[model samples]
Target chain A: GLLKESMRIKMYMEGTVNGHYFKCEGEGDGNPFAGTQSMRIHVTEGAPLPFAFDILAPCCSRTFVHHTAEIPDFFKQSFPEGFTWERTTTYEDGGILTAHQDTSLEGNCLIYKVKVHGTNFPADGPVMKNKSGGWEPSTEVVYPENGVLCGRNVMALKVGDRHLICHHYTSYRSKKAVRALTMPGFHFTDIRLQMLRKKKDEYFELYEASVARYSDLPEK
Target chain B: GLLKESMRIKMYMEGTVNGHYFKCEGEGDGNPFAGTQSMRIHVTEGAPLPFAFDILAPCCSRTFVHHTAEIPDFFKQSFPEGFTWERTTTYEDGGILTAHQDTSLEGNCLIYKVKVHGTNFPADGPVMKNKSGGWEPSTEVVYPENGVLCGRNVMALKVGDRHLICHHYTSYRSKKAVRALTMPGFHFTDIRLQMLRKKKDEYFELYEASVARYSDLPEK
Candidate 1:
């Protein structure tokens, strides 16, 4: 009942770069396309540069609760992990069972891509959840003193048949509601991550979820 | 008319950076979908951060004289503005076209996509070759103090059909060659510009050619 597991979800963010707020709720299924699309808001005033926004498709083999969640039906109204509408729906009472959704974005986050050529990484790829704490694959690269950083571009890390990528920037809040990217979420789970791929290629998104607070997060 | 009409051309640049010397060269045809690449020299021995390299392609449109130019056959060869090899064969009997090969770099340049939303631009877009001395299309937009600074990525400008794009980094020499992008090129012409794009898209590349001594270059 705490995690967001509903047929449709709502997402809203307010940026501090300037003073602006945007909300996108009841938008059918999460991310119409590959569950990844532009999430930045375009403003008539204020130099609003578009950032990253691909939450519907958490490209990863294993998530926190699910064991084999390579491509889970996270956006659909279904309760199970990979099952579709064709599968029987789960209900607690007379109504459909919906998970709790803390839309508030609280957590410390700062994501950017660095050059991969200069860094020292293995060929096969880095373990997603094991050694590196779901972050870097190798322990031979200098990252930002704080916050999260990925290799240049999105195709930096390689798991089995996928790769690791990072969303552009985080949209934070002020006080009562959601917090800023630089702020701390409930459990410090702001830095989200996902594994994505196509036919002959794959990648991993180096980040956490909306509720990620990023407290004591890995700095590799 | 004798510049590079062979439908194919070779470009080579050897310069110094961080007190180390590195050379790169390659060839390209007049086909956008075919062979066109940039060779970079990574100086792990010295400093690799700000390295050097050159692209062998029709990187820009036909540039006029001092407006900014690239060194062709820059191997101890001299050809002001620009003149192709086929033009040299015109000389049947005897000829003396010796010219000093000053493969030196000078100019200031830094190009990165910034928030166009906050900028003060017009609807019709800033005129390319008009108003702002062939540089900025708008009077606003803060740029790098000294050298050259473009709006953001490449598609910042809009021309006719093509869109502009900035080549990676410039290959500058130390002594008898090109200078670092941060450094000033001869006459301070490092901040070159070009029109680029496909189908219904178009942009202006903000960068000067090699040896562009960006002196008196615009900073808007």
Candidate 2:
């Protein structure tokens, strides 16, 4: 259980000032509807990054512990590298998972967004748009220190595609808590990359499940 | 009939310290929210006594106006000698009108809250809960002296019957305007007080006409 994975996670913080009216911009995208939709960013502890996913969605009720992770070098290099991140669930229609990322300097905190993308869900695809007389595939990239800071994400997807991108946002506390816990319950196992063999095994299992449910009943 | 109705109004502010938090408390009884709520105070030039107010409603809208008033030295030295106050208002729904009153010192602002009654329109009446459970109220005050210092008055009024008490915040604009004008619109044949009496008579005529065209009115 303690085996080291491909990724090492940690927390990092840094802040960006947008004039006097500082705000957290939600998810961004490559296409029209492909960008972030109506999502609320918890900028309480600065900006929300992708790593704190688990700390945000702490339980399984309307709110549950989905995942926990860190961008150990979000600042050392840039996001997904040296920062602590959390993904929380929004209690609105079309329940979407979101997160905020932040970094600290001395005792002060600077925040930014690290958009999170679900790689396995086909339904959570980036929005496709027909722009300038052409059909363009929409995609969103979330970096460590750079990304849209406030707004919403509304990604679209293909028939059986996966992976959804969202912009950065401000992160708040875990639902059960009020103040932010920077060194909260994050573990290396959460975001660590799975072993190649194990991932292959998982794919086999998925293939079997898909066949068992839909292969023979295709005519229907 | 511009008859001057001289009424005394009191505006009191208090400060308290509990643990590490400092609070400011203020109250204005018998204010004009009963159709007479827009009373404004202005600032004079010397030893500037700056103040401001903020409204947190109608899309989180903020409104502030600061000015200095010539407060008599004797009035500050003597207790409860100059003004008595009153207030009244009407409530509608569960929504509330939140506001804060503040003053400026040096350059920073000393902000504080003004406690008032809260109600639930059609369900609750105008009622206020004292901080210490006593007849007195408490408020949160922050004194910043960096720029034009400020004080605050935070008040909340929910749906229901309500009222506030405040002082007569007048201005020399009327006098200054008349002095600058050759043919003033005001009655030159009578003194201001005398002209006020005549205006009152005209108001009665308008009121009678309005009442006859509309429905029966309440006796004030």
Candidate 3:
């Protein structure tokens, strides 16, 4: 356990959310433990209203992730290519699936925007009212604004702190795929990684305000 | 340079390939070098065949191989679902493409069998006479028997020696996709990683066989 624990990268995050201080932290998995790991982000020192978000993620270690996942078949058949659809398929059964993948490697930030729309829905599937004010088909829209770093397949893309990654909904998941169409067989998360590099004590450098500024990382 | 180099895993393999002797060695890339690395494999201590094959691989570290590749558009339009062709597309251009991906995870080995086929031949494309004895369309066949661990995307699948991986061909390539149909964008290699433990020293282990029998590792 000690050896395995030592092989992982422990992470901690402390910042102010709505003026209240928040602390979030977690670590990667063992040397070669597949599947995924979860970390909770909550307002440790917040004002009143209680809230916390469970950040679902996998170790960014290449050694642990592997080909540790596969997208659900029902999810793939509908939107084979995430959101960037060059094509779509209408198969037997009234099953229909389509996802818009708007992925961009801007600077060093790999932002993923996926909006999945399905038609001829299963009566017992997941459905949410869309902007159209209609409950026609269940829609899943996720941008980095609503992204989740779920599968090892996707998390494996960010080389530690090198690239600032943000991916929306992907049918991709570890263990097994979601069997039902009710929910978009995936989780939703807001993946944000920031680095705070310099801390000022001032005496040696003679600074007025001891400001600790955070900075973004460079891409490969 | 020193720090980057230290982050990689240095591997050395010594065994009997055809009864003589062979010593092969290589290391993973720096903390995270995109692209790929090449390791040469040949009979180091045997009667000369005067031949060696370059094994191209990427760091299996999750932090390194993250989202580093994409399959060529032409390759995708042809065979969307790899070898298990649930679907295919015949686009506008006279060009045509198709690839088979028969992947399996029996026990611990993730065997990848991909055979790529393309037609509506380009004037200057890569084509080798298949068993059919004709020069119609270009054919690419890759089994674990002839698989290459190229690209961070594919290499990330291995997770080092945890799962034995062997992928043949794909439209997937880092940096950029191959423009010419001349060569099937990817590479071909036989990925085999064996582990050796418990060396015998006679009285220390009883019998002879300093012989060093090798063994395979376990899966997650």
Candidate 4:
């Protein structure tokens, strides 16, 4: 019994949130505030994100806000030429699947923004990044903005200094697609990066201010 | 004789300089004032500039300029952690290769400010990016207020409105370490990109303006 108190536990926690492998390794006491090392995850040298079919039922749509992360040094240049990328996609509720990617290189953080477009009777919800990874008896919930009334009661994790937010809703068209397809096969995944801190400055602003202060603008 | 006549032959048309790639492409041998396709002989993808190390004699230097037919693009980002990346090994006088890459997003053109960082009495010459992998090539010469020069008389095919100014210099470094490192084993060469209308622009004022616009410290 005394030995147990003197010994520390080292844990290697890993999971596949939307199919991306992320792991964290650390040693600590049984306390919630114990020390731990976060995992470093990245794509395979040069590879694109996984495909996800973001279709929905007739009456609902979904949105999610993934975690904010620091950019690693090894990532060289942005997606090369001919890379299929976008800030948004237009699948039109239930039409063509036009793939797009939205990524921004801010200070040092990468933020992924994913949204599902809706039709006439639009079903809009919080944008999200999949975090369906494993944990030790993981049990979490989401807090709805409207008093937990209409939005999802989803699981949550304390990421960095803020809680990662997630939401889930159902639509008839999406359920039909799932049933017609693999019943679970119509899913795609994507990753993006964006600035974490400042809601203000950007890299090109200084140049703009300078040009405005001096130089001519094509006689306009 | 007809084939020869059909083939476009370009001369050093007055202001036109030798060795600059003058693009000769398009649907027309149709018109003299027709927009000609600029073919780059020395430069390639990253807008590389070609040079010849073996052609130039030791203890000598040269310089040239390049112009682009159109405005190029500029890309740059900052690191929150700051960043430091160096070469595999340093070159000599002819070997002590120094390079500076400046991007003017305003003009869609990049100004290469380079020189062989060496002892006093340094000569100036032109250098371009090496086609065969590793890092890009840059030559050192007398300090250019702005813009690098070419080191060799390269061939050309296409011409454009953009221009690249280059300079190269070589010398027998008297220092034992310098001679041992730069001689025999490593000879310089250039590949890929080609030069266009070679003209030099001194944008020191732009830098000053940028500084005034973006500087975080108190006014000097």
Candidate 5:
């Protein structure tokens, strides 16, 4: 039925994985190669990702490069009492490629800045720089570094462009025995997919980047 | 109707405040004084609260005291990750008190500890111990110390005993993002009405302490 061939399929999908919900909604012209007209998926409300769901042409053709995304409002709410967003995009594509992961547990909030580059992404598997400034891979096999569903295949997504993604993690803990005495569940990273396309006219041509949450809650 | 009067009213409630969803549920006899046979409210699958829905009680009737509750799996999740449960029973019979508010931004978890004691209970209003080791009244009128519902007229609920309440807050932020990214939103704190019957012969006999989220989330 080529009559409906051009018919666009727009869908909003929601499901629970672990305790968090995953939402994906977009419209496509029924042809994967033709490209998705538009689509958006969020970890929650305040968080977003970089991948445009466009799925570049040429079949997984990685185009766009050199991308940067602003922190979402939902993620910004994690800052400390007096902590304000210090404006500085010191994060460089080349630099993040060499660095592991960096986490700052200062004040009431915690911020983590992870930079990845190269074809395989996490060139050295999933390992982060610890307080000692050394590489420390998460012990959990299901963790992103060892090929977690969310963190795995990141390299496969960044085929043609160099990108930078900023992931922040914060805790929600307060001193008092009678208030929001919920479990001190730590909110961690939502992978930011920033990809690029290399065109002769431009180097690291920016396409689009998006944020996504890929892990489940810890077992009770 | 009496048959139904003895029949318990069981229900569960949920809503969003700030970024968190608060859920409360319980089974109660038709009569307020008859009290909730049992009830629980949870922050996540790991944390929970005491019995409630009986705040309409006459206070200090020697009902529901010495009641041991099973810690819900949700609340239990907080114990790991360097979190420890600190205990101290300094519930004075009637004296002024001092304490400060605290918060953490490390993970998406908030922990609160509530301490309540005696009749005239902080009647002087919300004054917490300053960093210099002195009492300082909260400037914010909405602050619990400044007469927020929980700290306001704690006396109204202490019809029979001297009490001290401790409250805690923690966030439910997870790793790899994607799950429960919707701020577990620390929905916390409603002082349990715990009282004592001064039976001269028995002194301060404990009655019961029930927990509830007495205030709504502030409008962002």
Candidate 6:
């Protein structure tokens, strides 16, 4: 079977100015890149670089659906540069859910990291069937889990000060789909967030601080 | 600064049937994670886990582009089940680029792994003007250095035969973007390929053979 072998992942980057490298080795289960393994990277001698690695994991408490969230002042206070929040305004499957991006840094593009969070409103109608075979109070409510962090180290390099978008993404899924292995299936949900920033000294410091503050949390 | 530090990337997966793990460590120049580092993973035990890990890297050769790529007949012949090919059908930014997917095994949703390959057709019109203010045949092409594999370990696991999609992706970028240190900007290009498959004894054996055939290649 596919689960009975070993695997390897490796990446390297080189240019006249400097060199960068990355590698990860892990097999799969129900999840891709499962369990807890360490990945490595080194910024070889080079021009001064600016970058950021921001991640979001799941929260320990709470059920599948929770609520409206804020940027939490503790995280805000960690960076002297401050942070910003944006509302989620998209929907699918009958507009049952909404999402947003809370950016912590900005440059030519949304440089650095950004957190995406949102909610799935309870179903408003047809909550359940009554003895009369009629729709009763809407039970379509999705509990909200406040901002749980789930993300990775993303990057944006500047050429002559022009901030270029490297790669950026944020995703949402149902409780049954995003549920953690330790938990019961379909009992919880999660947010998948990825942040890309320039490689810089201060940005690294800030990112490390933020990660330390939110370590060991759940993820999508 | 952030670029001044060394980082590591790792992942692990465990269940009743088996356990899988992986790890990589390195650094980057202007980009995040850079350089060559050994990444390893193992499939200890379990029912066959269906997954794919596909990637691409800078090529070592140059030409109008190379051809006659194979997962190697040694590999093709290893699987008595044979294989299948799927053409890539999508375009953007004027549709100058084309891609296709070659699969060695198939199940629910192209189970196991698939290789993606393509080329950026030379600009149809003046792709873009150079700094000299004159159009220079849209030299804005992504070069082809064969056998630089960029991949993601994608998976499909079933609690009881219910195949579910896990992380899956295959991407392509330019030398200016994916290039590492030691190379002049825009002077070269490469090919990136990634494949995800079940961790079977024979599959792992075949992967090792293919890798041994293209090991120690440059990447970014």
Q: What is the DockQ of each candidate?
A: 0.01, 0.02, 0.01, 0.01, 0.01, 0.02
Candidate 5, after superposition: displacement of residue A34 in Å?
12
Worst 10 residues of 1 chain A by lDDT: A109-118
C-alpha root-mean-square deviation, each candidate: 23.9, 24.0, 24.2, 25.2, 22.9, 23.0
Off by over 4 Å in 3: A1-6, A11-60, A65-220, B1-86, B89-95, B98-220
> By summed lDDT, which 10 consecutive residues of candidate 6 chain A come out lowest?
A127-136
* True contacts recovered per prediction: 0.00, 0.00, 0.00, 0.00, 0.00, 0.00
- lDDT-based ranking, best first? 3, 5, 6, 1, 2, 4
* lDDT (10s digit) by residue, model 3, range A1-220: 2123223233343433223343433333232233222222222233221211111111111112212124222222222222222113221224343433442222222223333334553333221110111110011111111122222111211222221112222323212123323222221111222111111210010001011111111111
Q: For residues A9-63, write the lDDT of model 1, one tens digit per residue.
A: 2232222211222222122222222222222222222222221222222221111
Q: lDDT tens digits, residues B1-220, model 4? A: 1111122212110010123221111111211122112222221221222332211111110111111222110111111111111111122223233322211111212122222222121134333222211111221111111111112211111112211221232122111222122112111221222122231210000000000011111111
Give candidate 5 regions above 4 Å deviation: A1-10, A13-25, A28-37, A40-147, A150-220, B1-7, B12-26, B30-37, B40-220
lDDT of all the models against the reference? 0.21, 0.20, 0.23, 0.19, 0.22, 0.21
B97-143: candidate 1 lDDT, tens digit per residue: 11112221112111111010011122233221122222211110111
Q: What TM-score quantifies how close candidate 4 is to the native fold?
A: 0.15
List model 2 lDDT by residue over B1-220, tens digit each.
1111221222223211000111222221121111111121221121121111111111000111111122111111112221111121222222122122322111111122232221111112222111111011212122223211122323333212333322111111111122232221111010000001111111100000000011135668
Q: What are the per-candidate TM-scores when only chain A is compared?
A: 0.21, 0.21, 0.23, 0.18, 0.21, 0.20
lDDT of 3 by residue, B1-220 (tens): 2112123333333433123343434333322223122222222343242111111111111112211224222222222221121112121223233443342222222223333333453333221111111111111111111122222111111122221112222323212223322222321111222121111110000100001011111211
Error of 2 at B54 (Å): 9.2
Give the per-residue lDDT digits (tens) of candidate 6, residues B42-135. 4443323222211111110111122132212111222224222212211232211112222222221111222222222123411211011111
lDDT string, candidate 2, A1-220, tens digits? 1111111222222222111111223221111111111122233343323222221211101011122223221122222122333333222212233223433222121233343222211223222110111111322122211121111222222223433323222222222222222222212111111111111111100000000011223454
What DockQ number belongs to candidate 1?
0.01
Q: After superposition, how far is residue A43 of candidate 4 from its true place, in Å?
A: 24
Recovery fraction of native interface contacts for candidate 3: 0.00
